[PDB]
């Protein structure tokens, strides 16, 4: 039961708006905050929400290895944990997606016997899916760091989505405040041409940082990436999306074993991927679609559909547990004592909260029968 | 321009807390809200924020194809757009990650000339990285839908992370209110055994849905997945993580072209980055404080900010308006329509700040907020 803890949170990519409610609540409650963001409005916002913040960005330098910077960032955080304080680290995007020092600091804290947790956030890949209008499900997604992709000769799959981070710093171990001199970029272009061909599309993607900005979603051929004026547009916040070159055929034995039967591989569900070369759009309103739409006119909810049927007192406390870290800590320490303290709950509601199981909370908030809960 | 718009937003996975500030503000501002979420506290919260909501979940049914439900969900949203309304759709997690009807509705709205946008959210994969303590960077990540993975015989990489969604409904095209009868699950287990071997680990992952819950992070062998009591635990909110078998060797041409090692020295001999992946079988222990780490820590005592580091140096008025543009959708729409007229209306801005806002470029905003 050591005093001291480390919680690392994200801010998302687009200024302020892409932070989660829980990231904000933990920042506000912290004894000490350490942050690494690249948007001045987000920095200003953080400084209005906690009185004891330190900017980690000052530990980068011209010609200084990023690994040295990361060791320093982690040590600054853990030093405050060792003094018995509740410390929060903040990184832009998702704090564990292409971020070294967060994973390091949490592992050191855990090894010394302190509580340590990462809260997820909205990454640049999350933004890419939203802005390019693609789903990782169709037809699968491979995600790599650009230098690692080359050095370990990581496998390509020409039938799935490909996403490459850190294309602006190929083979570069250090930092510069004015930007990278990305003079090994041509090595990446050679690999892409060898796998996909000279005329295959590469989408240069930069998510908007400020709320009024449009994203950069510029299509180039692989061969165009050798032109000096195009290559120089690729910087420190650039990600590449490379769409599929072909569609993979279905396995007939698997279709038999799953029992689904010939399958046309070039037969798409609406909408088609706009970035695939020479792929026409599909029909949105086939006869099967029109039949489903006609059924709306006299639709009734199924008998097994259970509408929400809660109270203000119950919704208030469930919201409080999600938005007030201190209330959550009190509940976790003593479910029974906490449940007895909440004003205006019914006997059914109070018993369900003491248990805290999914089945019990659902019975209470949807007015479903339960012999135990109705006996309260 | 044409009246009517569609904005689709997410709620994250863990109840209420994983919703973004902008998802909340767009829900509040909407003329009508359509939602599909799978816990009651999140549903109750949404209903406190807008008086005009419809639950899309009522359009599922026992034995009804999910494709028919998806067509209906998308049509209810687009019908309201065609009436000239600003409509918001809401899906749990990230609204475009393993979600069919959002992409469909947005594509139809855009093709008919209406404004259409998706706002990203926190997905189950984002939660998985945070709870299992892994980074997609190290050593790469492949992500698939479980049935698609099987039907198209999609490749694995034994040297990278593998993440499989929808492992609880293999080959199933319909819906049931009481849950799926996942009787083709053995076909997935056979494929995993062929690619990885019977004793390789598979992590059964379920992110906590309520704020007091712990995640499920249960490691099993591929062979253990054939045991009835274990297979029964895999349901509609289950995801699988399969760690690498081993570390992959480096390409020698690439080491030379990137100038990463002098000739005559043996490659792939540096220790792994700390910390090691705790799920990878036979992973060696990595030490946190090597000589290079201890030297960096010694330098902290007399560290000064570099000359090129630019401290924030802004004002209440400028910070307030940039926050407003992020948190008030109406204010953002006004600003976008006429930058000059909006910037003239803002109270207490300096002439430098007012001009910077009127331009709106990143270089201009940064100049104003760091006093350069
Ligand atoms: C050090 S990593 C940090 C990523 C971050 N934690 C996240 O969640 O996306 C930096 C890389 O993230 C990607 N990135 C950062 N900001 C971006 C943006 N606005 N648009 C596209 N990619 C971005 C680029 O690939 C960049 O080289
Ligand atoms: C229809 S999809 C929707 C995914 C959602 N949009 C997201 O952003 O994660 C359903 C699948 O998501 C995954 N999933 C949903 N909730 C989850 C949870 N609490 N933990 C782990 N995986 C989950 C499972 O693989 C499930 O079969
Ligand atoms: N990962 C590096 C470079 C990203 O381009 C950083 O720490 O910013």
Author numbering:
A (entry chain A): 7 to 267, 272 to 280, 281C, 282 to 386
B (entry chain B): 7 to 378
Could you give the paper's own sentences about this structure?
The full-length native protein was refractory to crystallization, but an 18-residue C-terminally truncated variant (OphAΔC18), which lacks the sequence that is methylated, was first purified, crystallized, and phased using a selenomethionine variant. Structures with SAM and SAH bound were determined by preincubating the protein with the cofactor prior to crystallization; high-performance liquid chromatography (HPLC) was used to confirm bound cofactor identity. Apart from the addition of the methyl group, the structures of the two complexes are identical [root mean square deviation (rmsd) of 0.6 Å over 684 Cα atoms]. Even with prolonged dialysis at 25°C in the presence of 2 M urea, we were unable to remove SAM from OphAΔC18 to generate an apoprotein (4 M urea unfolded the protein that we were unable to refold). Compared to the Pro242-adenosine (of SAM) interaction in UIIIMT (which binds SAM very tightly), OphAΔC18 makes more extensive van der Waal interactions between Val243 and adenosine. The C-terminal region (Ala252 to Met378) of OphAΔC18, referred to as clasp domain hereafter, is not found in other methyltransferases and comprises extended strands and a helical bundle (Lys322 to Met378). The monomer has the appearance of a ring, with the C-terminal domain forming a thin band, which is closed by interactions between Leu333 and Pro335 from the clasp domain with Leu27 and Ser31 from the N terminus. The clasp domain of one OphAΔC18 monomer wraps around the N-terminal domain of the other monomer, giving the dimer the appearance of two interlocked rings (catenane), a structure that is rare among proteins [reviewed in (20)]. The location of the cofactor relative to the protein is identical in both the OphAΔC18 and OphAΔC6 complexes. Superposition of both sinefungin complexes with the OphAΔC6 Y63F-SAH, OphAΔC18-SAM, and OphAΔC18-SAH complexes shows similar consistency in the protein structure, cofactor, and where present substrate positions.
